[PDB]
Amino acid sequence: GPHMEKLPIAKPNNAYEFGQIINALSTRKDKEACAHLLAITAPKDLPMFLSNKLEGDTFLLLIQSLKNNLIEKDPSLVYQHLLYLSKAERFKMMLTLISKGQKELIEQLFEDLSDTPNNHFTLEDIQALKRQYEL
Numbered sequence: 021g022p023h024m025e026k027l028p029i030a031k032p033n034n035a036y037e038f039g040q041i042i043n044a045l046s047t048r049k050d051k052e053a054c055a056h057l058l059a060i061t062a063p064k065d066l067p068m069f070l071s072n073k074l075e076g077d078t079f080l081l082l083i084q085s086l087k088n089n090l091i092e093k094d095p096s097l098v099y100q101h102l103l104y105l106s107k108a109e110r111f112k113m114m115l116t117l118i119s120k121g122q123k124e125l126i127e128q129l130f131e132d133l134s135d136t137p138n139n140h141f142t143l144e145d146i147q148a149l150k151r152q153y154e155l
Contacts, residue, residue, distance in 0.1 A: 035073050039073025039074075050081075064104060066101060066105060067108040080122065099141045106153065
């Protein structure tokens with residue numbers, strides 16, 4: 021990960037802005053600046069941004085950003101980001117291009133949410149939504 025300073029983030033207004041920030045972080049491998057991007061992004065806007073500007077590495081970046089950073093800030097925002105991410109179309113191509121040992125990271129994402137009892141979601145809601153990820 022680069023020692024040279026991080027590029028500053030203003031919120032994504034539209035799919036190209038979301039994609040152009042994210043692809044810069046996929047260039048730096050930045051999970052922590054990606055975590056700031058989810059801390060400012062809405063789950064409702066997220067699948068509309070991911071429409072055409074969604075790739076294998078940029079999907080995996082946000083997954084590793086969730087199962088490390090956002091789980092310790094708000095696991096219910098992780099749950100809602102994963103809920104609306106399941107509505108994205110190109111999302112379903114990603115789970116086919118990802119290798120089995122890299123797909124396990126998506127399991128560890130839900131395994132950390134399973135560990136958290138929460139005022140916004142339940143295990144019943146987890147085990148229902150994870151089905152859209154075929155885990």
